[PDB]
Write a protein that binds this ligand. Structure first.
Ligand SMILES: *[C@@H]1O[C@H](CO)[C@@H](O)[C@H](O)[C@H]1NC(C)=O
Ligand SMILES: *[C@@H]1O[C@H](CO)[C@@H](O)[C@H](O)[C@H]1NC(C)=O
Lengths: 103, 51, 52, 51
């Protein structure tokens, strides 16, 4: 495998390992916050994907606001967060559903 | 605290042992850095010393 | 792309100040855990502030 | 396939009117993605939508 700091790799057949969770620790960092968020409203445009599967179901969401990126989508079944840009643009995100007719 | 009178300092020529440099520090040419990196380093330093 | 597996382990854990005049932050320290994901995914770490 | 669809991003849709080559329509519900249809197969050809 072409990669830095190591050129040895290998992959057997589908293993489906038990767990591969990570561990993140923080010591010090800065982050700027605007706290000047204004009225913003979006809507759903398209929806497609698989059933409850690997790639999931991708849903396109369109927003329109003056702030660069201030959004947090929360719903039952699955929670998805993403970043947007200034103005009106198109964004595609994926969620996890457990029903064929998603209504 | 104060500069007291000294007879040995009347000649105007003082030896090198009367000069003390507090701490061992050396300098070198530097390179300007952006303010974001400096602020991040300051935040990390103030987080590493909470007392 | 998409994101999943939210944590929100250390929300509202800041001790900042007026923040350079209008709004700024100083530091955020804590500890969280990210579960395993499929190759080609994104694990987002959303922070929450009491003021913002 | 059924008709045209109006998309609003600033706020909800209070009321709007659409125009076609030889027909017109007007409908509102108050949501973001609203659908407006004129008839069954009335728009056949090259026309311009003026909302
Ligand atoms: C939404 O409509 C179809 C549905 O799949 C899609 O092909 C199209 O690209 C989407 N619209 C935009 C503006 O991307
Ligand atoms: C928003 O994005 C633009 C372009 O990427 C940048 O110039 C501007 O500084 C950003 N504003 C904030 C508050 O991040």
């Amino acid at each position: 495998s072409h990669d830095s700091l190591g050129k040895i790799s290998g992959s057997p057949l589908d293993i489906t390992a038990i767990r591969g969770s990570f561990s993140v620790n923080y010591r010090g960092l800065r982050l700027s916050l605007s706290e000047i968020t204004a009225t913003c409203t979006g809507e759903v445009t398209n929806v497609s994907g698989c059933y409850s599967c690997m790639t999931g179901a991708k849903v396109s969401i369109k927003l329109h606001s003056s702030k660069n990126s201030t959004a947090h989508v929360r719903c039952k079944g699955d929670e998805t967060a993403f970043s947007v840009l200034e103005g009106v643009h198109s964004y595609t995100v994926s969620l996890s559903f457990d029903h064929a007719v998603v209504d | 605290e104060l500069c007291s009178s000294d007879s040995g300092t009347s000649s105007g020529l003082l030896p090198s042992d009367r000069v003390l440099w507090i701490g061992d520090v050396a300098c070198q040419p530097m390179t300007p850095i952006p303010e974001e990196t400096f602020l991040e380093l300051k935040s990390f330093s103030q987080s590493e010393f909470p007392d | 792309e998409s994101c999943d597996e939210m944590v929100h382990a250390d929300s509202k854990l800041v001790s900042c100040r007026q923040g350079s005049g209008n709004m700024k932050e100083c530091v955020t320290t804590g500890r969280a855990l990210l579960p395993a994901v499929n190759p080609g995914q994104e694990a987002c770490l959303h922070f929450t502030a009491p003021g913002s | 396939n059924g008709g045209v669809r109006l998309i609003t991003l600033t706020s909800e849709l209070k009321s709007a009117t659409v125009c076609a080559s030889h027909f017109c329509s007007s409908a509102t519900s108050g949501k973001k993605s609203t659908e407006i249809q004129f008839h069954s197969g009335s728009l056949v050809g090259r026309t311009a939508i003026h909302v």
